[PDB]
Structure 1
Amino acid sequence: VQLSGEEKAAVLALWDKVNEEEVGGEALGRLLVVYPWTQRFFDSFGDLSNPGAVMGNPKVKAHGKKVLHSFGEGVHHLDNLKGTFAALSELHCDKLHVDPENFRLLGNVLVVVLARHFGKDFTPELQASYQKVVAGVANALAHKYH
């Protein structure tokens, strides 16, 4: 959201190196292994027993990719998040009934997987930034929860 040209440029340049399948299936997988209560929502997706099943499950990968693509749309509509997610919010509150906080969670999980993937170049400076983006997307996905 409200930040800086040099930070934006930075955030963006990093997002051209983000393999959305890899980092995608990784976030959703860990979310499920680290915060097991979220296994309840994605309940059809076959076997989500041990972390080995979660991680190598084709449906975690495919939805993961759908999640991270949604994130990028956001990394590129810096000034219009609320508008961007003014539907993924409705489908999350009503049809899904998902607690607002579970978002910030998947967010911090997405920052951690970026962290392992881009080592030292994932500077406290650049994560400093990402927290803002993850913060904004969270607030937008819950916007319609009143």
Structure 2
Amino acid sequence: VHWTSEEKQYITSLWAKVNVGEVGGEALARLLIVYPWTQRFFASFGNLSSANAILHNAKVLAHGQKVLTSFGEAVKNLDNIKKTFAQLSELHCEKLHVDPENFKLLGNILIIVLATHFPKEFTPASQAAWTKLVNAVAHALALGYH
């Protein structure tokens, strides 16, 4: 990509205030609830039979924390995202066979979650930078297919 000082600042400044556990659990729960076919990949996670069950699922929440921690690795090294996710790209593509379209859906969910958590700071400009971020992460993970 091509990061401007302003974009990097919108990303790092907001991330420093992010409750990774809360935001991560929210993002994954919403993925499973809003796009139910994604539950196919989490059979070992136990009860996912309802939105309430998903929101109270310890494994879903813990996994969401690990996923957002991963996004954090993109935030911490904005110019080397493709490289940082090469490993995870192989996992999701070669091992799990997750269609790349879902990487974009999760990214969209994260944008909405960030908006619910930072109403004043998540301006259109901030959204633009963060959308560029989630898209870069999705692109990096999809490389294991292209």
Runs of 4+ in 1 over 2 A off after TM superposition: none
Q: 1:3 offset after TM fit, Å?
A: 2.5
Higher share in helix: 2
User: Alignment RMSD, CA only?
Assistant: 0.8
Which 5+ residue runs of structure 2 have no aligned equivalent? none
Report how far residue 120 of structure 1 moved.
Answer: 2.3
Paired residue for 2:47? 47
Identity value in percent: 65
Q: Counterparts in 2 of 1:1-146, with a 5 A limit?
A: 1-146=1-146
| Cα contact 2:27–2:64 (8 A) shared by 1 | yes
Number of aligned residues: 146
State how far apart, in whole Å, the 1-side matches of 2:2 and 2:56 are. Answer: 37
Helix, strand or coil for the counterpart of 1:11?
helix
Q: Deviations over 1:9-54 (max 9, x none)?
A: 1210100000000001000000000000000001110100111110
- How many angstroms does 1:6 deviate by? 1.8
TM-score relative to the length of structure 1: 0.97
Alpha-carbon distance in structure 2 between the residues aligned to 1:143 and 1:11: 23
Give, in whole Å, the separation in 2 of the partners of 1:77 and 1:69.
13
Distance 1:103 1:17 in 2: 24
Distance 1:140 1:109 in 2: 18
- One-letter amino acid of the counterpart of residue 40, structure 1: R
